[model samples]
Target: AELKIFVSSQHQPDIWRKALDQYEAKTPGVKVVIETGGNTSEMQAQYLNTVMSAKDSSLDVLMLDVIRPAQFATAGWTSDFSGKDLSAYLPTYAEANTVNGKIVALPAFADSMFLYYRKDLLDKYGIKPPTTWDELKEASKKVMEGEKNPELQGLSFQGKAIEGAVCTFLLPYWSEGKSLVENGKLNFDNKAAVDSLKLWKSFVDDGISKKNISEVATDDTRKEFQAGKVLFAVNWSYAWTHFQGKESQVNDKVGVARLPAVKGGEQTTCLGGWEFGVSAYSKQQDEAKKLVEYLSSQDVSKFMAINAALLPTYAALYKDADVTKTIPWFADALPVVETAKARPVTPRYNEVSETIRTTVNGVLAGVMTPEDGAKQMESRLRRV
Candidate 1:
C-alpha cells in the first residue's frame, strides 16, 4: 500500500524523506510518499481547510499546528488515537493533542518563544542576560547608547498582523497569570490585556524597536537578528540554526535564553510546534495509523532532533547524551517548553486569533491606545 503524507516545507521535508527510508525498509509491501507546501501556520491551515472540507482522500496524514487538533477533530477531519498512551511526551503536547479525552493527533516536535541575544555584545558590556522586563529595558538602553549604531535595533519581534502576533500578546498576559480562554469560554482580563499591549507599544515609543515594526513578520525578525542588526530577539527555535549558518553575520555570536518576565509576575512563553494526524477521509486507515504511530515514535523524534535540529517532543531526549551533544540548547529549553502556555484551545480559535492579532497590530501601530485596544478586543471576542 502507498500512503501520502502532507508536511510543511518549513519543517525540513528533505530530512523527513531520509528518516522515512528506515520505516520503509522495516515494513514490507508499504511505501510512503511525501507532499509538501505552506511556509506558515495560517497558510498551511488555509490549504488543509479546503482539502478536509471537501473530504479529499488524496492525502492520508497531516502535519498540524499545535493549536489545530481541537478544531480539526471537532470538524470530523481527523481520526482519533484515544487508545494510545501519550504520557511520555511533553506535558504541553499531551494536553494540546487530547481534546475532551480523545487523542486527535500525535506530537511531531516541540517549540516555544526564546530570547535570542548577541553574546559578544553582552560580554563586551559586562551585562548578564535579563530575567525581568525592566532589566531588559535598562540593558538595551545601555548597549544602544554605547554602541552608537544607527542601524542596530535593541529588539526585533513580530508586530505585524500575523499568527505570531497572537503569542506576542499572550506572553505578557500569561506572565501576569491571566488566561485568554478557560474551559472553552472567554477568560479575558482587561487590566492585564491593557498592560500587555502597553508594554509592546512602549518599546516602539522608546525607540527600542524599529519605528516600522508593525510591518514586521516572523521571518523578518529572523532575518534582522541573523544579520547582526538586533541586540535581542523574541523568536522560535528554528532561528537558532539560521543564526549559526556560515553565511549568517551573527554566526557563533548568538545566545538563547528564556523570555524575560513582567515585573512581579512569573516567567512565561508561548507554546508552538507541529503534530501529525491521520486523515478521516483516507481509505487506508489502518496503514495510515501505523505510519503515524511510527512517525510520532521516540526513534523518529530522536532522528529529527539529531539530524534536522528540530526540538524533541519526548522528555528524556532533552538529556540524551547524543542529542545534547548535537543541540546543547535543548537542556535549557526543557523547562521553557514544559511550562509554555498554549493559545486558546477552542474550535472557534480562528476568530479568537484574528481578534487578538489585529488588535495587537493596531496597538503597536499607534492607531489605538492600549486601553482602547483592550476594550475593543473584549467587545470583539464576546461575539465569538
Candidate 2:
C-alpha cells in the first residue's frame, strides 16, 4: 500500500515535490499524498485533531514543530521513535525527539534565530552589528540618525501580539541570564525577564525599531527587511533565502551575525522546526516507527535540503560539504543551533505559551501591568 505524507506548504513546493518523487523512486511501492498548507502550526494542530478523533490509524506521517510534541505526547497522541540508530544522531536531535524521557518525534528540519544585517550599510556608518541589547538600540539610533535620508531602520523585529513574536523575544530574554522557568515556577514577572522585555522594547523607545514594529508578523517583517529598509532584522534561518528569492529585492548586500548576547545574559536562541511523529491511534505503530526512521535517513535529509531548503536536524550534516554547499544557512546556523533552546517543555505547552504571550504583550501594550500578567501566568501555568 502507498503511504500518505502530510507536510507544511510553507516554502517552495517544487523542492518538496521533487524530493517526494525521489523518496518514492528508492522505495518503489511507497507513494505520498501531500497535504500542504496550514503552514507549520496549522498543519500540526490539524494532524493532532485528526489523529485524536479518528480512534484508528488515519495519518501515516505528521510534520510537527518543536513546541507541539510535548502537548501531543501528554495527550497520548505520539508514538515512540527511540528505536532509531542513536549513532547517527546527536544529543540535540535525540533530546528534541524525546518527551519526558520517552522517544516520540523524529527530528526533520531544524530552525534557529540569527541577526540579519546589511554589512554594506553598517560599514558606511562605521558601526558594527550589535553584540547586546544596548548596542542594538544605540546602533539603530545612530544608523537612522546618520542616514542621508533615513534610508534604513536601525532594527526590525517581530513585534506582533502573537506566539512568533513571543518566541523571538525569548531568545534575548533567556540569553540575558534569565529563563522562563526555574524549579518549575514562572519567572516572567521577575525583574530579569521584565528587563528583557523592556530591553527589546527600548529599540522602539530609541527610535531604532519602529513603534509599529511591535505589530509586524513574519510576512511583513520579511517584506520590510527585503526592501532594505531595516539595517538589522531578527528572524529564523530561512529568512536568508527568503530575502534572496525571486520576490526579494535585497540581495548581495545582506549578511548574518551571531544574535547578540543579552547584557551579561546566556546566549539562547528559541528553536523552531518540524519532526515526524505517529498517531497514538495508529495500529501501524511498528510500521510507523520504520517510516520515522526512514524520514531521518541520510537520503531523505539530503533530499529534503536540496528540494525543500529546510535545514536538516542532524548536526554533523552542517559539516558535510554537500549539505553546506547546498544550504548556505547551515553554515551560519550551526552556532545558533548549538545554543538553540526549546520552549519550556510542558504538557499544556500551547496554552502556557498563549498565556505567556497574551500577558507579556498585553503588559507591553499597557493592557495589564507586568505584575498582573505574571501573576495570571503563574496561576494558569500551575492549573493547566
Candidate 3:
C-alpha cells in the first residue's frame, strides 16, 4: 500500500511529487501517493478539517500552514514530532512547530514580511532604506512629491478585510512592542495598538497609500510594486521570487529590508511558513515517518531550493553557495526569519484572528476610528 500525502496546490505540487519520487526509487515497494488540495491555503485547510474530523487515516501526511499547528495540536490531529531529530532546522521555525511542549510539525520552508524598495529610486533621492516608520514616511513623502508620478504610492500593503490584513497589521504591533496576549487574557486594546492602526490609516488619509487600498490583497500589493509605481511595499518573502522573475518590470531594481520599526521600537517581522506533519489517525505511521524524514532531509531541501526556489528551514543552507546564488533574497531573509515572531497561538485562533481582521480592517477602510477599533477588538476577543 502506498502512503498518501496532501499538499496544497497553492505551491508547486508537481515539483514536490518529482522530489518525493526519489524516495520511491531508493526504497523497494515503497511508493508515495501525492494528493493536491485547493489553491488557497484557506480552502485546503477547510478540506483537511473536514477529513480530520472523522479521524480519517486515508490522509497519512499533511502539509499545514505554520499557524495551523497550534489549532491541529489542540485538536489532537497530528503525531508527536518531539522525538524527531530536527537540530538542523532553524531554531525560529523549529520552535514554532512545538505546541504544549510537543513538536507536532517540521517546517518545510519559512517566510517573513520584508520591506521591498526601489534601489535606484532610493539612490536617486539620496535616501537610505528606512529602519524606522518615521523615516519611511519622510522618504516616501519626499520621493512621491518630487517625482510627481500620480500612480506612485509611498507604501502599499494588504489592507483588505482578509487574513492578509491581520498579518499586515501585526508587523507594526510587534515592532512597536505590543502584545496580543498576556497572563492568558486578551491584551491588545492599548494606546500602542491604537496608534499603530492610526499610522496605517494615515497612509490612506495622507495619500501615502491609495484610498482604495482597503480593496487590495497580497497579489494586488505585489502588482503595485512590480509595476514600478510604488516607492516602497510590504509583502511576504514569497514575493521576492516573482519580483526577480523575467515578467517583472522592477526586476534587478529592488532591494529587500526588514519591515521598518517604530522610532524607538524594535525591528519586527511576522512569521509564516508551511510544515509537514504525520496525521495522528494514520495507519501507516512508520511509512509516514519515513516520508517525513525524506522530505525534511538536507538533500530534499536542496532539491526544493533548486526546483521551487523555496527558503529552506535548514539553518546551514543559507551558507551554501549554490542555494544562495539562485535565491539571493536569502541574505536579507535569513536574518529576519531568525528573529521573526509567530502570531498569537491558540486553538481559538480562527475566531481570534477573525475578530482582529474585522476590527483593524474597519479602521483601514475608514469605517471606524483606531480607538474604536482597538476597544471593540478587546471586547470581541474576550469572548473567545
Candidate 4:
C-alpha cells in the first residue's frame, strides 16, 4: 500500500500528516509517500504544471489549495468526483471544486481568518474582545502597558510580501465594505480600501506592532503569539490548534473571535481550505480515490477538527458532541466558515496573487498610500 501524495510544504502538512499515523499502522505495508513543492504563489502554479503536465501517474493523490481546483480542472489534471455523493459536504466548499458539471475535488479541510486575544490579559484589563479596529487599538494599548514587558506586542500578523499578507489585508478591506473587484473593475481606491491600508500602517507607525513587521510571515506571527508576548493576533484556523497545545505558553489563555472591523463596520474573514484530488493520469486512481474518501470520512474529519483545528467539511460533524467537546470553538467557527468568501479562482491566480502581495505589502510598509496602491494594483491587474 505504498501511496504517493503531493502537497505544499508551507501549511505544515508534515505535522498534519501525523494524524494518519494510525491509518498507516493498521494497513500493513502501506507506505504513504508525501512530495512537497511550491514556496510561493508563482512557484505553486509552476510546480503543478511541471508535475501535472507530464501526466505523471506516479503521483496519485494531491492535497490541493482551495483556489487550485479551478486551475487544475482547466489544465485537465484532475479526476472528476461527481459520483462521490458530494451532497453530504458543505455546499460552499463543494461548489468551489466544481467546474461546470464536474466535481474535481473534495474538501479535506476548511479555514478562515480569526482574531485571537489573550483572555487573561483582556479580562484583567477589563476589556472585552474588540470588535472594531479602534477598540482593538485601545485594548491593546491598555494590556501592553499593564503587562510591563517591552517585548510584548500589541498585535501580530503577517505583513511580509507574500500571499499571507494579502489575506491579512482583506480582513480590514472587506470589513470596511471595500471590494477587491467590482463590475469587472478594480475598486480598491475607495475610502474604505484606502483607510484599511492607513490603519495597517498605523499599527507599525504608532508602535502597536513591531518595526520589523515587513519580515513577519504567518509562522513568525504564530511563534510570537505562542511565546505569550502578543496581546492580540490575526491569523488563520491553523493557529488555534497550536495555541491550545502544550508547546504554547498561553495555551489555555487564548480566545479566538472574528477579526475586528473598521470603526463602523462588522467583522470580516477570508475563506481558505485544502481539498483532496486524484491526478487525472494516476495509475492508482481507484486507490487514490479510496484514500481521498478515507481522509474525508467522518472519522478523519473529526480527528482533524480535534487534532489540527481544521474545520470539517461534512455538515453533520459540526453538531457531533465529541467534536463540540473537543473543540468548542467549532460551534462558533461554523458561522464564520458559512459566511467566509472564497478568493477568485481564475487560472491566473498566481499572477493576480503575486501582484496583490506586492501591492498590499507596499501599503503596509508606507511606501505608498492606499489610493496609489489601489491605482497601481488596478492597472497591473487589468493588464493581467
**lDDT-better candidate, 1 vs 4:** 1
Off by over 4 Å in 4: 10-19, 25-30, 37-46, 54-56, 183-189
Pick by lDDT: 2 or 4, better one: 4
Native-vs-model 3 lDDT? 0.82
Could you tell which candidate, 1 or 3, scores higher by lDDT? 1
Model 3 lDDT at residue 140: 94
- Which candidate, 2 or 4, would have the higher TM-score against the true structure? 4
Ranked candidates, highest TM-score first: 1, 4, 3, 2
Worst 10 residues of 2 by lDDT: 35-44
Clashes found in each candidate (C-alpha, N, C closer than 3 A): 0, 5, 0, 0
Q: Each prediction's TM-score against the native?
A: 0.94, 0.87, 0.90, 0.92
lDDT of every model, 2 decimals: 0.89, 0.69, 0.82, 0.80
Model 3 poorest ten-residue lDDT run: 38-47
Once model 1 is optimally superposed onto the true structure by TM-score, how far is the C-alpha of residue 194 displaced, in angstroms? 1.3
Give the per-residue lDDT digits (tens) of candidate 4, residues 73-149.
88889889866667778888878888777888978888888888899999898999998888989998898888899
Model 4 local distance difference test score:
0.80
Candidate numbers sorted by lDDT from highest down? 1, 3, 4, 2
Q: Clash pairs of candidate 3?
A: none
